[PDB]
């Protein structure tokens, strides 16, 4: 029960690729997945000391039926788009998902050109993005980002598919969300309303005090507890992309969950509000362009094509 | 002494190649920003010493030139000159404002240009925007090891920088970009031999072919000149990769510093128009230019005191 | 699953070890802090992933323990005991909190240790706080390379984390510290030979020394401890070399860890009281222990879970 | 049970090391033998942590029963000599084998000195090889090597005794051969026709797709089913050598293997050929001058004596 | 022609400042040292070539200047001036001898230190020893971007080498060391902005104030000195972050090169004692000036023929 | 304005020396080589920008250059001296062409190497091929630092660069090698201290012995020589270690640069012949030379113009 490298740390550059399957596309497809662990080893062996190259493939709902027959992963659907009261959480096109990391760009590059060439003429492009570390894994809002992401075996619990979905072990369920940034309107507040939208001291990224840490803070909303009273958990894999002479200046989001309900919830609080908190502070400054749900399987179950 | 800008500095894994155009009434704003630039760069330069290497190189056109000073002019100084060929075309397109940016790491050159940017807003109007990575060991889209004949040390400062010539503006040089894009299918269509035939070297080993094989229209016979005196004519090249997967966009972005456009024009001319012995550039079968600008870079200090 | 602190990791090239007591009612700052020091840790080191290699590890002392927590106690905790050999002295010294603070960068450890204090001021008196460093070749302040026989893998597991023989804190650790200062003089004045024959080990080749010429009485020889199993009892070290140049201290931060002190303990005995073959450790001649204190390191769980 | 370290990565330095013990020899190598992972800690520690030495010791087939009394590794015998139509695997004296990496060649020569100095007078040199990484993990002949090395799981699987000889699990069996390379035959051909040979491309080392990939090249050889239907798989550790004044370039082979059967295969269908093809056309342009085989034990097994 | 010290080396990760006094007839041996100064650099630093950097300078005082040579003096040579502003003093403090150790690496600076304090042993008494390091992205213990507008190159060097003006110590420099501690207590209790307004740059960026919002008492304000031809007055700047988190020390080690002390004594003048416009430098209400002591730090042949 | 080799450029981590003799009438595919000899390093060198450092110095002997060559020669050229002293012997032995080929990785050294002789094949017969590998903290095979005293800035230029006293081939330089296999046995033998007194400084730390402990015949007093004038006279040495541990082969590849070989040569015969206080160098007590050429080091431009 092998997974792909979906616990794997983030890296310096990062390839997003989503495609959608055009019509009769689906044997060139299936051909690929079969292959995309052979095109892996192929480019990241020229690096091997300290290249980490590595690429998770992930099947949207729509189009695992289209490409297998028998049964589906328990969680997989389309992206539930969210209309709340201000902001708005999209659902886009999107069936196949290449999530490619390395140390290097010239390798995500290599990889994302071999992929696309063999599905030249089968899917058509709908999001490409390149990610870049941003000085001491900051983000475009200038935070560190990513400080609370599980590690060890709790990022092996909040991540992996298990006994609950047998079939399906050693997958994980994928949430991208493109996210444009209102830089001008960010840059407008003291760096203490930043860090009270955030939840964080900006320099230092320690966390502020419970009696200090507004309701509608981002870290507030995306702290959940489960029945048992443990803490719900993803793995966040975001990197900043941009165009300065486009005024874009974005945040990829990309989280791997064991259930995809782990994170519908932190959206749901996020872009729904709750009692306490009418939205996401964070959402006043960022807006949601895409948005899309795939399930990525074992390593194994690609091979086996 | 006139202190140069980063002109003779090498390669860097990173790039960020940004063209504007000054909007009316934009040229007050510019000038601030112009003095102001040196400054900005060491801003976010020092901030990763000693392995960041951020540098900036700002370039103005020749209608910009006017529009922001008075008195003399660089002497090389004016539009870019389109080349049509009987069958390949260098266009020239527009831009007032070079911004070449180079670090170990894109996240410098981005902060950079955002800093730039921010100062220009609402006064420049962006035209081109690349971002540039090393590709492998030193190579281009094609494949090929690129850069490799760069001058280097005393024989770059004489290539490059403006002397004595036009001694107003000693310490600055001439820069040509132009944005290739390339036909990978077609590219790859050829066998390494016939690539090797086309660019005018070794493409594993980077060995220049021998003189008895050399194709008169290989791009390295093409874009060996020798002036009267039968001195080489040199420039020094900063290309970067850049690209799209899911546009096929696999381009060369091309940038070329010289003391003299003259020395750069005659190897664009030699190129598209040819000569006796080649009707044109075999490389340019495979690239497509789709911007083309000349800017003049001054002094470090010209740029200070404004 | 009961998840450990970082007893287990290698050395790194810079450390900062911080020794507390707890000033009379500060135990309420303290647990609070005791619950966050996980969190503060990601807080300052996911800055300098993936190099920076930040850890912390906390310990508690036998009479702090008491005065934190009701329930039960680890079965081998107690007070640092004090011995009083012929010649030399082990000194128990105040200690209720243990901070081992260990980076590739000592700014990662500077900048952990003053969020800890920060938070600890008024309910905590520093005892002591040492800057360890990295010495060439993994050297000590005698010039011997210093770590080599640590365990590895499964082994240093055995050796240094509590299991099914005290259930309640499977995970945990026990650490002893002694800061030990160095008569440099007094050490340069031997040959290279006799410093072999002091520790037990090649200078420059860091190789072991034969058995048949392996002085009874070397540091070596003492402290190889056979289990009644006859395999080998092992500890793992941490030591950092650190000094002052002009107050002519050169040190050895002396860290230990194992999964119970009665290992620790016997090596300590003899070393300071000696056996029958060897009157103490020749290396005692050239070291003077100024600190002496031992703490549990709970298993991480039971941090967070207060 | 603790392996030697018979599954770690390719370095950028390696020695290779293949002595005889000579007549009455016996007592000096077995406390040698006691003694290597101290020898490798000693030099080993002071390059902490970049330094990546690893010395893996192998004991051959007629050496084993010279050296030890009881129960021998099952897989265990002298290198099966094969004589082709055209090209010859020979098989060549070696009693141990001392295969040393790190990222440094005066960590593997300090460790090699520390060795020969305790054996002088008991062992006979046979091979002394210096290995050097060569640009993007290539070799001699300019194509990417090593791309299909197990990793993981797979490699544990394919590398390690286990159940099936339970006295030497841990254990390992290594197949080295010394390969000299006509470089200038080889430079006549064209990439394709290189490529052609190997059976991957040259500068992206994308593996040939299955319609054109010939019969009788490198990897075609190489792949080898078994009755299941899985795949059977080595783990490679070559390293490039040479010496430009004399001519040679080289490849140094070293293979690990669970069991030799599967090592021994492959070299039968490259030597001797199959049905489709007369023989590895990679043999044209290569030439073995050394074969040994050695049981690599666990490293308890060392110890314990 | 004159060879310097190494007085224009960037800045390193680990810094050793060591000032010593010369005891009564200790002069011999110091004179001994001085001469064998640069063998000792060369004798720890080949073993940590390529990237060790180790370099180390050597600063005489002007009373101790009297004591070990006859024949003339630096021009600019006195000792320390101290400053009693009305609010803020600067403090002068005994110190004959500077040694400043620079490398990227701790263990080199102490190894020479150890060497140069070896052979100095009854011969000097110490002042100050401070262990420097970097602190992230070139930070101070304020949390700002520090040596950002140092200069580089031909400005370096005009800045920084005594010249013409003075022959006989051509290549030579004058160092000013001041040891500042901090109280962070009172800084943290700023909001960022505040403390954006006592420095003079953005906090997170290090973009510098627009000049219509820099207030006339900021840290870059009070430190920007233009001289009598209106051309910029310029020092070059190697201060380390130090500190021990128990003892609540937070501290700036300033190190200062210039060609001429009368710039350096400006500067400090204007902060002091202030200006029309302003007070004094805001920064001092956060900062304790402890030592203050002024080196000529000669060329490297003048010590060589000793 | 004459151009020199990399003849001043710093030890590397690997180096590839290359000895051989121009066979009957390679004379032709000598010079043509010769020519190209800076394009194929530049070729090779690109594809590691910016962290290869590959360089390749080119030497040519004196029988060599009488049949490459018409006109003047250098004036110091000639065949290197045999010297038979009482008890050690430095034997020439032949070699027509040198390439000292450095980089800081193996790869590029043997790329380079590959492509020089696939050009030179069956004209040239390999007389001697060695692979240099740094060892440890810039050791040798007798287990001490090796390189300190090199001269580094103007005093390198001024010991190894021909001026004007050979105006010709101003920009050139002598290069001398010779291949050194060691006694390890007997050298083992000696004790540390024993050792020191051999070389003339200390073993584990790289410092000079001081002047009334270092023998007459001690490596460090015979190697340094005071010309008439009273000026120090020095060499710039790029020795590499090599070996093979199965044939108990450890070696100390010698090459010395200088300006004129009488330099090298007066250290040779002081080594070799010795002087009125000592025998010999002791050195060669435990060190045979195997090989011994002479070769000069044209400028660059010499090469280029063939
Ligand atoms: C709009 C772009 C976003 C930005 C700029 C952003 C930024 C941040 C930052 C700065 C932190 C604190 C440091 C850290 O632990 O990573 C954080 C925490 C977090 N974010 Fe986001 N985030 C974004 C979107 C999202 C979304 C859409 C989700 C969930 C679907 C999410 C889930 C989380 C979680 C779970 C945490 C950790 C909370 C904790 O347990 O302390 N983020 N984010
Ligand atoms: C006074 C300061 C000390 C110094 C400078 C020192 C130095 C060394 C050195 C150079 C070695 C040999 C290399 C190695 O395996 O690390 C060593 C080994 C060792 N030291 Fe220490 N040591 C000191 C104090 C202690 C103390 C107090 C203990 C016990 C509590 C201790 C326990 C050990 C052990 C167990 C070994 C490994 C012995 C073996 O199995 O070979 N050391 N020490
Ligand atoms: C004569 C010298 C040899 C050279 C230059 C060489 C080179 C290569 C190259 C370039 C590849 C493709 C890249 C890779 O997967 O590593 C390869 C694959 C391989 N080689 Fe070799 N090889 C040699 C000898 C051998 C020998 C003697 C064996 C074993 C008997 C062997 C077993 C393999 C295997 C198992 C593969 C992987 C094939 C696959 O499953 O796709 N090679 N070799
Ligand atoms: C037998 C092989 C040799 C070895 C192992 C060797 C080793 C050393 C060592 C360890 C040093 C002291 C550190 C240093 O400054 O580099 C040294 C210095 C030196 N060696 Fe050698 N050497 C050898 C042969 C030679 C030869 C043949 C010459 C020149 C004829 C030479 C010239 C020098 C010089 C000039 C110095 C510096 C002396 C000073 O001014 O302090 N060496 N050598």
Same mark, same amino acid.
């Given at each position: 029960?092998?997974?792909?490298?979906?616990?794997?740390?983030?890296?310096?550059?990062?390839?997003?690729?989503?495609?959608?399957? #055009?019509?009769?596309?689906?044997?060139?497809? &299936?051909?690929?997945?079969?292959?995309?662990?052979?095109?892996?080893?192929?480019?990241?062996?020229?690096?091997?000391?300290?290249?980490?190259?590595?690429?998770?493939?992930? @099947?949207g709902?729509?189009?695992?039926?289209?490409?297998?027959?028998?049964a589906?992963?328990?969680?997989?659907?389309?992206?539930?788009?969210? #209309?709340?009261?201000?902001?708005?959480?999209?659902?886009?096109?999107?069936?196949?998902?290449? =999530?490619?990391?390395?140390?290097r760009?010239?390798?995500? +590059?290599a990889?994302?050109?071999?992929?696309?060439?063999?599905?030249?003429?089968?899917?058509?492009? !709908?999001?490409?993005v =390149?990610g +870049?570390?941003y000085?001491?894994?900051?983000?475009?809002?200038?935070?560190?980002?990513?400080?609370?992401?599980?590690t060890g075996?709790?990022?092996? &619990?909040?991540?992996?598919?298990?006994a609950?979905d047998?079939?399906?072990?050693?997958?994980?369920?994928?949430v991208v969300q493109?996210?444009l940034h #209102? @830089?001008?309107?960010?840059?407008?507040?003291?760096?203490e309303? !930043?860090?009270?939208? @955030?939840?964080? &001291?900006?320099?230092? #990224?320690?966390?502020?005090?419970?009696?200090?840490?507004?309701?509608?803070?981002?870290v507030?909303?995306?702290?959940?507890? *489960?029945?048992?009273?443990?803490?719900?958990?993803?793995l966040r894999?975001?990197?900043?992309?941009?165009?300065?002479?486009?005024?874009?200046?974005?945040?990829?989001?990309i989280?791997?969950?064991?259930?995809?309900?782990?994170?519908?919830?932190?959206?749901?609080?996020?872009?729904?509000?709750?009692?306490?908190?009418?939205?996401?502070?964070?959402?006043?400054?960022?807006?949601a362009?895409? *948005?899309?749900?795939?399930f990525?399987p074992?390593?194994?179950?690609?091979?086996?094509?």
């Amino acid at each position: 029960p092998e997974p792909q490298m979906v616990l794997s740390p983030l890296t310096s550059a990062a390839i997003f690729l989503v495609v959608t399957i #055009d019509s009769g596309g689906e044997d060139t497809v &299936r051909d690929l997945l079969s292959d995309v662990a052979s095109l892996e080893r192929a480019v990241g062996f020229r690096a091997q000391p300290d290249g980490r190259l590595s690429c998770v493939t992930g @099947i949207g709902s729509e189009a695992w039926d289209r490409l297998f027959s028998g049964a589906r992963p328990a969680g997989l659907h389309p992206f539930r788009e969210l #209309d709340g009261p201000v902001h708005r959480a999209v659902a886009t096109p999107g069936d196949l998902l290449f =999530h490619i990391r390395a140390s290097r760009l010239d390798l995500c +590059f290599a990889l994302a050109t071999e992929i696309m060439g063999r599905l030249r003429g089968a899917v058509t492009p !709908q999001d490409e993005v =390149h990610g +870049f570390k941003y000085f001491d894994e900051r983000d475009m809002l200038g935070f560190v980002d990513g400080t609370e992401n599980p590690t060890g075996a709790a990022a092996r &619990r909040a991540v992996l598919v298990g006994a609950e979905d047998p079939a399906f072990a050693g997958g994980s369920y994928a949430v991208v969300q493109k996210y444009l940034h #209102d @830089i001008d309107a960010w840059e407008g507040l003291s760096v203490e309303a !930043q860090e009270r939208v @955030i939840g964080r &001291r900006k320099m230092t #990224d320690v966390e502020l005090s419970d009696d200090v840490k507004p309701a509608d803070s981002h870290v507030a909303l995306t702290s959940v507890t *489960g029945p048992d009273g443990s803490d719900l958990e993803i793995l966040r894999d975001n990197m900043p992309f941009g165009s300065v002479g486009r005024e874009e200046f974005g945040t990829y989001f990309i989280g791997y969950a064991r259930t995809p309900e782990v994170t519908e919830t932190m959206l749901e609080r996020m872009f729904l509000g709750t009692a306490s908190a009418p939205h996401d502070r964070i959402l006043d400054f960022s807006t949601a362009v895409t *948005g899309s749900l795939f399930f990525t399987p074992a390593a194994d179950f690609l091979e086996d094509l």
